[PDB]
């Protein structure tokens, strides 16, 4: 029921050319739906989801114009930050920016985010209230003072609570079969004898959305974390996600070990055993 729209920008300076590499990616929920890559021939924001091709040419002109200007801002910013940090012109450096809005099940604005980084570390971020900035260091404190003078927080907040929610709602209505919906995990157990005396139980969750999920083991009613392994949740490539959790147990004693699966798409957490 809950949804989000996010944009991610990455600019990487090049000690050879000048024009940094700029890549912008838009998401609705976990679906990339638009991209711009300054390396590409088109020099346009391009569609990456079927349902966004329903947007008119007015749309693609406004979006291409915006991200190109952002890439130009990032290019100036790379120079400004090189100066703040007294860095040479010879190294490659990276600016990252992300922002976006979350809505609850009723479709109303729930929270907004905006955060910027330099060389893979926090630089400046909008606070949870959407009214003030957190600067990680003395250079970002200069940026914060500049942004306080130009009402940058107010502008970002107005977008996050307004146009961000408005267009997120529009895209959600554009998406139909292509827009991934809540999908409960399909579960199964595998069992691999290791030795004359141990075996691996692997609890699988497949085909689920959203990606948030909790797999836990219990031995005779109590949580078991020793002798367990858990892979990071991973995308299946089709809009759904996968995860597994494994436990090593005395062979033949598998009946004591239950996988518990918690997911928003389940009316009640699932339990399963070998």
């Amino acid at each position: 029921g809950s949804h989000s729209m996010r944009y991610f920008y990455t600019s990487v300076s090049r000690p050879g050319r000048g024009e940094p590499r700029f890549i912008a990616v838009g998401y609705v929920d976990d679906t990339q739906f638009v991209r711009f890559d300054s390396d590409a021939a088109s020099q346009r924001m391009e569609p990456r989801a079927p349902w966004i091709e329903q947007e008119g040419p007015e749309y693609w002109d406004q979006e291409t114009r915006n991200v190109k200007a952002q890439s130009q801002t990032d290019r100036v910013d790379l120079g400004t930050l090189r100066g703040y940090y007294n860095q040479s012109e010879d190294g490659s450096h990276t600016i990252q920016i992300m922002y976006g809005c979350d809505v609850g099940p009723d479709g109303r604005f729930l929270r907004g985010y905006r955060q910027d980084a330099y060389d893979g570390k926090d630089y400046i971020a909008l606070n949870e209230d959407l009214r003030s900035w957190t600067a990680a260091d003395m250079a970002a404190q200069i940026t914060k003072r500049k942004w306080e003078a130009a009402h940058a927080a107010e502008q970002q907040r107005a977008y996050l609570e307004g146009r961000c929610v408005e267009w997120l709602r529009r895209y959600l209505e554009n998406g139909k079969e292509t827009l991934q919906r809540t999908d409960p995990p399909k579960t199964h157990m595998t069992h691999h004898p290791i030795s004359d005396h141990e075996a691996t139980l692997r609890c699988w969750a497949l085909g689920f959305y959203p990606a948030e999920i909790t797999l836990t083991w219990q031995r005779d009613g109590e949580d078991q974390t020793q002798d367990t392994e858990l892979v990071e949740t991973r995308p299946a490539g089709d809009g759904t996600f996968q995860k597994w959790a494994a436990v090593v147990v005395p062979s033949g004693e598998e009946q004591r070990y239950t996988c518990h699966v918690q997911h928003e798409g389940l009316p009640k957490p699932l339990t399963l055993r070998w």
Partner: peptide, 9 residues
């Protein structure tokens, strides 16, 4: 739709 360009750092 995107936010307009961020304020220069």
């Amino acid at each position: 739709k995107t936010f307009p360009p961020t304020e220069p750092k």
